[PDB]
């Protein structure tokens, strides 16, 4: 589903890149700190905002399709049915990330 | 022994 | 947590071979079972090119939370369901994607 993520603690909807950096900063700027949002500049997909080494990196997550919707951060090399699956997976696996997702940044 | 992932 | 159709519990490798064959022997046809040789973990029985291959799924524990892996801990999953849904989209170490659930007869 592409609607499951819209009531999660780590999902912040349409906020700016600047707003997400402030939120993560207020939360500590600790490694693994993360949130997911809709991109204001690219409303089609989502952004995983992650903190690593006191810096906030932003990773694009775009939806795509076999008539089945899926999300990906790497042009389809790694695919996910929902954003929740993508988040749960990178709590265990680094993937394209510099570190694991450790702490949810909340609203 | 008999696994495709060598376990 | 597993009441899923593709999970057949404690059945043999020979039984899984028959079940998969009986259901069509189509590529992507699969089931998950408990390992007879490794009672600790599970086996993904997968059909590819008219042959059935078996993939061992070993559990581990970190911080008191259970997780599973098919690649000696290199790729981990919170549950078998996550492992299955993930390999329906991603090849991973498998020769093909998980396409069809193998269920018991009705």
Author numbering:
A (entry chain B): 422 to 486, 488 to 529
B (entry chain L): 3 to 9
C (entry chain A): 426 to 531
Text lifted from the article:
Growth factor receptor-bound protein 7 (Grb7) is an adaptor protein involved in cell signaling where it interacts with a number of tyrosine kinases via its src-homology2 (SH2) domain78. In this way it plays a role in integrin dependant cell migration via its interaction with focal adhesion kinase and subsequent phosphorylation in focal contacts, consistent with its homology to the C. Elegans protein Mig-10 that is involved in cellular migration. It has been shown that overexpression of Grb7 enhances cell migration, while inhibition of Grb7 lowers the migratory potential of cells and is therefore linked with metastatic spread of cancer cells. While co-overexpression of Grb7 and ErbB2 occurs due to the proximity of their two genes on the 17q12-21 amplicon, Grb7 plays a role independent of ErbB2 in cancer progression. These important roles of Grb7 in numerous cancers have established Grb7 as a therapeutic target. Following the conventional nomenclature for SH2 domains, the Grb7-SH2 domain possesses a 3 stranded anti-parallel β-sheet consisting of the βB, βC and βD strands, flanked by 2 α-helices, αA and αB.
To determine whether the fully formed staple (rather than just the O-allylserine functionalities) is required for the high affinity binding to the Grb7-SH2 domain we synthesized the G7-B4NS peptide (for G7-Bicyclic 4 No Staple) which included the thioether linkage to achieve cyclisation but was not subjected to ring-closing metathesis to form a staple via O-allyl substituted serine residues. The dissociation constant determined for G7-B4NS binding to Grb7-SH2 was KD = 4.9 μM. To investigate the observation that the ring-closed G7-B4 peptide bound with 6 fold higher affinity than the G7-B4NS peptide that had not been subjected to ring-closing metathesis, we determined the structure of the Grb7-SH2/G7-B4NS complex using X-ray crystallography, to 2.6 Å resolution. The asymmetric unit consists of four Grb7-SH2 domains (consisting of residues 429–527), two G7-B4NS peptides, 3 water molecules, and two phosphate anions. Additionally the Y5 of G7-B4NS forms analogous interactions to the Y5 of G7-B1 with the phosphate anion positioned in the pY binding pocket. Likewise, the G7-B4NS peptide residues 2–7 all form the same interactions with Grb7-SH2 as observed in the G7-B4 co-crystal structure. Electron density for the peptide, however, was not visible for the O-allylserine sidechains (and, in one molecule within the asymmetric unit, was not visible for the N-terminal two residues and, in the other molecule, not seen for the C-terminal cysteine). This absence of electron density suggests these groups are flexible and do not form an interaction with the surface of the Grb7-SH2 domain. There was also an absence of electron density for the thioether linker indicating that this linker is more flexible in this crystal form or in complex with Grb7-SH2 than the equivalent thioether linker observed in G7-B4.
